Amino acid sequence: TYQEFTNIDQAKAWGNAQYKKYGLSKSEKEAIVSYTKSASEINGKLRQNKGVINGFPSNLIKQVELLDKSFNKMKTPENIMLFRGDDPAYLGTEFQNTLLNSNGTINKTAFEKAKAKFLNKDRLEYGYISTSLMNVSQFAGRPIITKFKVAKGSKAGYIDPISAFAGQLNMLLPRHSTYHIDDMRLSSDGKQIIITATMM
């Protein structure tokens, strides 16, 4: 049983309540703000290097170590569900230019091939995972929506107050996370794939 927030006021109150007691240091807050501005670049470098940071520039090694350390203070007090939007390349190079029909809907054949590739499989992410407490506007245009089931006691932080995209109920999960794909379905209007996954 995982808490899915369905009310914006409820989600914001819960998020603010967690943030109030983290006690993040000045340098930790600075590292997080900076991450939200350059997330795709940082996560891309982590993926290219399979999580090995020893050869990174000195500034970036420092930042990654601060982000990692930040999670010693940020844990969820209950089973929760988190949301994220992704573009077609998330499924592989063979889906980048095939997933979408010209009219914006998901191509049905490509959907079936993506389901065969990923359903009931584990996936390892070398980057951090930026998410939200709800299905928010910052990724309404994205063709893939993932709902992550995160267990009580797991590392997870409400970072909305120290995010460049404040107002979007922003949450962060740690790098090198693994999750199991439980379900993949087409939305009722055929414009998105909805994925359900359980975090390990």
Swiss-Prot record:
Q: Which enzyme class, named as a word?
A: transferase
An example of a GO molecular function for this protein is: NAD+-protein mono-ADP-ribosyltransferase activity
Q: Which reaction does it catalyse?
A: L-asparaginyl-[protein] + NAD(+) = N(4)-(ADP-D-ribosyl)-L-asparaginyl-[protein] + nicotinamide + H(+)
Residues that coordinate or bind NAD(+): 36, 43, 47, 84-87, 123-125, 139-142, 168-170
UniProt-reported outcome of changing S130A: No effect on enzyme activity
The TR mART core domain extends over 3-200
- Per the UniProt entry, the Enzyme Commission number(s) are 2.4.2.-
Q: Quick one: where is this thing mainly located?
A: secreted
Q: Active site at which residues?
A: R84, S130, N170
This protein's source sits in the domain of life called: Viruses
* Transition state stabilizer (site feature) positions: N170
Give a GO cellular-component term.
Answer: extracellular region
User: What compartments host this protein?
Assistant: Secreted
Which keywords label this protein? Glycosyltransferase, Host-virus interaction, NAD, Nucleotidyltransferase, Secreted, Signal, Transferase
Q: What does this protein do?
A: ADP-ribosylates eukaryotic Rho and Rac proteins on an asparagine residue.
Protein family according to the UniProt entry:
To exoenzymes 3 of C.limosum and C.botulinum C phage, and to S.aureus ediN.
Subunit and interaction comment = Monomer. Interacts with human RALA.
In its UniProt entry, what is this protein called? Mono-ADP-ribosyltransferase C3
Q: Which organism is it from?
A: Clostridium botulinum D phage
Recall the taxonomic lineage recorded for the source organism: Viruses, Duplodnaviria, Heunggongvirae, Uroviricota, Caudoviricetes
Which residues of the complete protein appear here? 45 to 244 of 251
